[PDB]
């Protein structure tokens, strides 16, 4: 597949790598989200190292209030990181 | 390697490969979007009428261009389609 198709496939696979670990195999609980951010997004996790700060990030991602981050919420998260980095591209 | 960080870099850079050709260099007009879709997302594709209803849908603020935020909303939706298939 072409680069952007492969990027989409990595978005999907990386989510399930972590969501399937515990409980609802299709949503990220706090431990799963933490492990995804730390392993998979180490360039972008900075301030969120602090536990209260990570829980705040988590409560912002969880827009339907069911205590987990589902795939849509995770895509919105990734889109926010992309929009952050795009500010830097545009200058 | 962090495949998800590589994914993110491709999501940003691919947009700018096309948005710079005409008009606002930070937005895709319909011609630039058709190029991007044809060349970068061929698996997701088509007539010109098809490119137009897709354009309409992506351009959620009705300014006749697809901006970076609209493009990320689109890519989220395509990932969601693939995810729904993955889940079964």
């Amino acid at each position: 597949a072409c680069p952007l198709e492969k990027a989409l496939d990595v978005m999907v696979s990386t989510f399930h790598k972590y969501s399937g670990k515990e409980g609802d195999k299709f949503k990220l609980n706090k431990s799963e989200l933490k492990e995804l951010l730390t392993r998979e997004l180490p360039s972008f996790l900075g301030k969120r190292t602090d536990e209260a700060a990570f829980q705040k990030l988590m409560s912002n991602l969880d827009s339907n209030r069911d205590n987990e981050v589902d795939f849509q919420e995770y895509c919105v998260f990734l889109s926010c990181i992309a929009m952050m980095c795009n500010e830097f591209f545009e200058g | 390697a962090c495949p998800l960080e590589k994914a993110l870099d491709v999501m940003v850079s691919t947009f700018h490969k096309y948005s710079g050709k005409e008009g606002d260099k930070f937005k895709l007009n319909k011609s630039e979007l058709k190029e991007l879709l044809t060349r970068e997302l061929p698996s997701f594709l088509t007539d010109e009428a098809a490119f137009q209803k897709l354009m309409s849908n992506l351009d959620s603020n009705r300014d006749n261009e697809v901006d970076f935020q609209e493009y990320c909303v689109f890519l989220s939706c395509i990932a969601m389609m693939c995810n729904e298939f993955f889940e079964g």
Binding site: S63, Q72, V76 | C77
Partner: peptide
Amino acid sequence: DAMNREVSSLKNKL
């Protein structure tokens, strides 16, 4: 999010 809302809007259109 405005973004979550926008994703839901578009997904229902595509």
